[PDB]
Amino acid sequence: ALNTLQTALTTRDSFDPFASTRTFNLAMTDIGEMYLMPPLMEALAQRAPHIQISTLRPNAGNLKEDMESGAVDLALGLLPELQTGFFQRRLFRHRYVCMFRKDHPSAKSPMSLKQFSELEHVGVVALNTGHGEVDGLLERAGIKRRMRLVVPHFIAIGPILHSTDLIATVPQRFAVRCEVPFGLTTSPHPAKLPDIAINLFWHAKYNRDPGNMWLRQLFVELFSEA
Amino acid sequence: SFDPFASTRTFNLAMTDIGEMYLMPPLMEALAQRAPHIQISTLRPNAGNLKEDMESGAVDLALGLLPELQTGFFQRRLFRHRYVCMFRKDHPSAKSPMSLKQFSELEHVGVVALNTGHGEVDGLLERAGIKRRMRLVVPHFIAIGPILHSTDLIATVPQRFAVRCEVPFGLTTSPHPAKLPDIAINLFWHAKYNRDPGNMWLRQLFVELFSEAHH
Amino acid sequence: ALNTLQTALTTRDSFDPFASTRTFNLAMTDIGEMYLMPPLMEALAQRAPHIQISTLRPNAGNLKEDMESGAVDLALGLLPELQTGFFQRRLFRHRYVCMFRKDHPSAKSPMSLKQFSELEHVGVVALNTGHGEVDGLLERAGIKRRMRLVVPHFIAIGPILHSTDLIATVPQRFAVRCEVPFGLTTSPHPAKLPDIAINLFWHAKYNRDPGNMWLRQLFVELFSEA
Amino acid sequence: SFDPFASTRTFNLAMTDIGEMYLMPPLMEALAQRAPHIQISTLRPNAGNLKEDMESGAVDLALGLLPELQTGFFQRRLFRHRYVCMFRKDHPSAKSPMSLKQFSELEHVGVVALNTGHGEVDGLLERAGIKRRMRLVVPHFIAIGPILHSTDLIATVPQRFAVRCEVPFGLTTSPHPAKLPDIAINLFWHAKYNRDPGNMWLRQLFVELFSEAHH
């Protein structure tokens, strides 16, 4: 509460997008990186040709403390531990679909729940993320899955589905980065899977930092559906 | 004894993100026919204590460079990673084979890949006086294909990564102008499981699918 | 594996429902108790007038070990820790609804998601149960709730909703025990809440115990929708 | 100072299942008008360490018998629990006032209510030689109303429980034929919060709503 006066009183660093050589450090998941980085870098080529971006996984060593010190500029995801002293803003929702190769011998769109339970699955653990709750949702709902393969993260899902008859449960923003490159298609998901709301987070200290405010607004501009 | 066509065993496999995307598609494709009822689970070597989980049988096999797996462990060479330079096929200026000059002039995406053979690349380029405009640094490889497709960035990447991304993301590669060492990729198992028939069978499958011995 | 021969070889205790004075010990949640005990006791009055029933909460001190020793006869719920050595059978599903008093000034059926977010809520923590996951589901989906009151368990929900304009998110099997007694009504739930599949569990040791088999079949008979 | 009509404070309240169903409906009804923006959270006293959580301010008030809350704690009597016998209104044979004879002949649902004032009832009846056919034993009170409505069982229950269930579940009560002691229900707070204006205001509300001092 007390430092909110010294936060306001301190003179704010100038930010000129055309000239800045600032490094911004951004926390996101492997899904965030996959989805957000290509359009973000594409926008930046034209808007801020000289800044540097560095990313990091949230689940790696005091995000809250690093955002408090200015070491990490922004974070995207659920991040329930970011409370007092943090602003947040909803950007968009993950909507879950079923993904499988284009010429799968039997998979249909719209897939039935019965077929979903007959087919073989790849699972992604995605520990401590919103995606990591999906397995429990399905189990608690008594929806059987033949879990042929389980991997910890998302990198190999495109290539795996391309080469096999496995099906996957993925956010639509993941599917979008995979469908054309890997010859994949999707179906609306037969199970009752709720959306995951993805937020942008910043520390109160950087609420009126011009560079921070500039990058945040670019994220809203590019990705907001809220 | 072990029966692949009837086995219901779960095999747990330690590999990096590159190993997962390179190894798992052909492995799973082979297993569809050869062991239709087994289950596969994988994990990163930098998760739990790998040595202890292999000694105990929690992790069946490890794949990668893995220099700490010494006493108690067997290993077998599968192949080498060779570094290439990758960029989108209609890049405005990037050429193949690329010069060290163009390499140091263009803009890069870097992958940190902490505690991995790839994690050494930054340091090696630096110690060689090879300068790089690091436009984007990411900790792992997942987003590299899509990022290169949408930008004029270039990446330093194993050839085995590139082969999974070239056609999907419309990219091409060049031999790498720097003198980056090749990285040996080995198959590792604990001595306690040297003669487990399940473990032996899986190892043989990895050798059959991936060993470049001849070749 | 080895004791499965001594399990089969041992002579099984006779069970005559009309004469048995056996105590059966049953593990269930406060929702299970509320829902299952009234019809179960009603059936037993007519079927087995002399047995005793005792219940207990699963989340209290080595259910798995107590079922292994025969101290607890059956368990109902999710109970993910009951694996090797346990049979299970799906009985029915919890389906989630919104519950509020009959003459609530503004609550409608079917309630909108927007209204759901405008109204004030009572929440039940229900730690380590399927119901305890509902709060996280709603939060991760970015569905705002004004949490006016939070209680740990279900007992007071009927009386609370009767006396206030609070709304609650509850299984329909809970609502059914509350609607008429407390003057309450329900709406289909505006959020995308998946069902919770409730199973009956027994240890392999008692798979062919006639008294155990008799009680299990009564649970299937009375409650199965599977 | 403390402003009830503008406060945004969360108050955390320890009470048993009976206290929650008896206390919370009129409390929340009073708060609708008197403090529309505060939040209430409750918990069972047999969760965490209550003493430590009250000393630290994590738990604002406790309600019940709570004999361990001694040094460091203030308390104030709110009312007494009197035991009654409860059964469905058209029970085939149960009478009010019930005899000890009929009581020991009928079938019972018991509530264990571990580590609670009610937890003493079984032992007291036993030591008095009052026999009971314990047809059903449950650990807590939630299902008692519905169970009594659907069966010919009878229950020994605080009158404050009965008042919440009589009309909803179509039950009636009888004075209890046994000599069960009344149970004092107190309001407890830690000495550190004796003069917290928020805490004082809530305490006064509890006294206003529930104290039977006169009465």
**Whole-number Å distance between alpha carbons of A192 and A141:** 9
**Inter-chain residue contact A41 with B135, CB threshold 8 Å:** yes
Resolved by: X-ray
**Whole-number Å distance between alpha carbons of D82 and D87:** 16
**Inter-chain residue contact C196 with A93, CB threshold 8 Å:** no
Q: Which of residues 158 through 177 in chain B touch A, CB cutoff 8 A?
A: 164, 168-169
> Within an 8 Å CB–CB cutoff, is residue D30 touching chain C?
no
Look-up: residue for tokens 């010494």?
A: B70
**Inter-chain residue contact D136 with C39, CB threshold 8 Å:** no
Q: Which of residues 118 through 147 in chain B touch A, CB cutoff 8 A?
A: 134-143, 145-147
| Chain A hits for C139, Cβ within 8 Å | 80
The experimental resolution of this structure, in angstroms, equals 2.2
CA dist B58 → A146, B160, C131 (Å): 21, 28, 32
Per-position b or e across B124-147, b if 16+ CB within 10 A of its CB: ebeeeeeebeebbbbbbbbbbbbb
Contacts 24+ apart (CB under 8 A), D45-54: D45/D14, D45/D15, D45/D16, D46/D114, D46/D115, D46/D116, D47/C152, D47/D14, D50/D14, D54/D14, D54/D188, D54/D189, D54/D190
Number of domains in chain A: 2
Assigned token pair, B75:
């290993």
Q: Give CA D28 to chain center in angstroms.
A: 16
CB hemisphere CA count around A64 (13 angstroms): 9
Query: Is B118 in the same domain as B163?
Result: yes
**Whole-number Å distance between alpha carbons of D150 and C33:** 14
> What range does the domain containing D126 cover?
83-181
What residues form DSSP beta bridges with D154?
D108
**Whole-number Å distance between alpha carbons of B51 and B70:** 9
Query: Is A76 in the same domain as A43?
Result: yes
Assigned token pair, A139:
């189990």
Query: Is A103 in the same domain as A61?
Result: no
Neighbours of C22 (CB within 10 A): 18
Query: Is A14 in the same domain as A68?
Result: yes
Assigned token pair, D183:
């149970």
> Within an 8 Å CB–CB cutoff, is residue A49 touching chain B?
no
**Inter-chain residue contact A45 with B151, CB threshold 8 Å:** yes
User: Which of A90, A137, A142 has the CB atom closest to C142's CB atom?
Assistant: A90
Query: Is C226 in the same domain as C175?
Result: no
Assigned token pair, A110:
């719209």
Query: Is B215 in the same domain as B190?
Result: yes
**Inter-chain residue contact A33 with B142, CB threshold 8 Å:** yes
**Inter-chain residue contact A53 with B143, CB threshold 8 Å:** no
Query: Is D112 in the same domain as D171?
Result: yes
Contact present, A72 and A203 (Cβ < 8 Å): no
Report the CATH number at residue C89. Answer: 3.40.190.10
Q: What SS3 state is found at B134? A: strand
Q: How are strands ordered across the β-sheet holding B155-158?
A: B155-158, B83-88, B171-175
Query: Is C159 in the same domain as C190?
Result: yes
The conformation of residue C101, written as its DSSP 8-state character, comes to E
**B60 to chain A, minimum CA–CA distance in Å?**
15
**D183 to chain C, minimum CA–CA distance in Å?**
21
| Chain A hits for B25, Cβ within 8 Å | 156, 159-160, 162-164
**Inter-chain residue contact C196 with A140, CB threshold 8 Å:** yes
Q: Give CA C143 to chain center in angstroms.
A: 25
| Chain A hits for B32, Cβ within 8 Å | 164-165
Q: What Rg value do the Cα atoms of chain C yield, rounded?
A: 20
CA angle B76–B80–B82, rounded 5-degree value: 170
| Widest CA span in chain C | 66
Query: Is B103 in the same domain as B44?
Result: no
- Which of A37, A47, A179 to mutate to test binding with chain B, by most B CBs within 10 Å of its CB? A37
> Within an 8 Å CB–CB cutoff, is residue C150 touching chain D?
yes
Chain A neighbours (≥3 Cβ pairs under 8 A) are: B, C
Look-up: residue for tokens 């689970």?
A: B41
**Whole-number Å distance between alpha carbons of B50 and B14:** 8
Chains C and D touch (3+ CB pairs under 8 A): yes
Query: Is B209 in the same domain as B170?
Result: no
User: Which of C45, C52, C56 has the CB atom closest to D134's CB atom?
Assistant: C52
Query: Is B70 in the same domain as B114?
Result: no
| Chain A hits for C136, Cβ within 8 Å | 133
CA dist A135 → A132, A138, A143, A148, A170 (Å): 7, 5, 10, 14, 11
**Whole-number Å distance between alpha carbons of A138 and A222:** 32
CA angle B150–B137–A221, rounded 5-degree value: 50
Query: Is B145 in the same domain as B101?
Result: yes
**Inter-chain residue contact C166 with D28, CB threshold 8 Å:** yes
What residues form DSSP beta bridges with C86?
C203
Q: Which of residues 68 through 107 in chain A touch C, CB cutoff 8 A?
A: 78, 80, 90, 93
Nearest chain A residue to C134 by CA: give it: A137
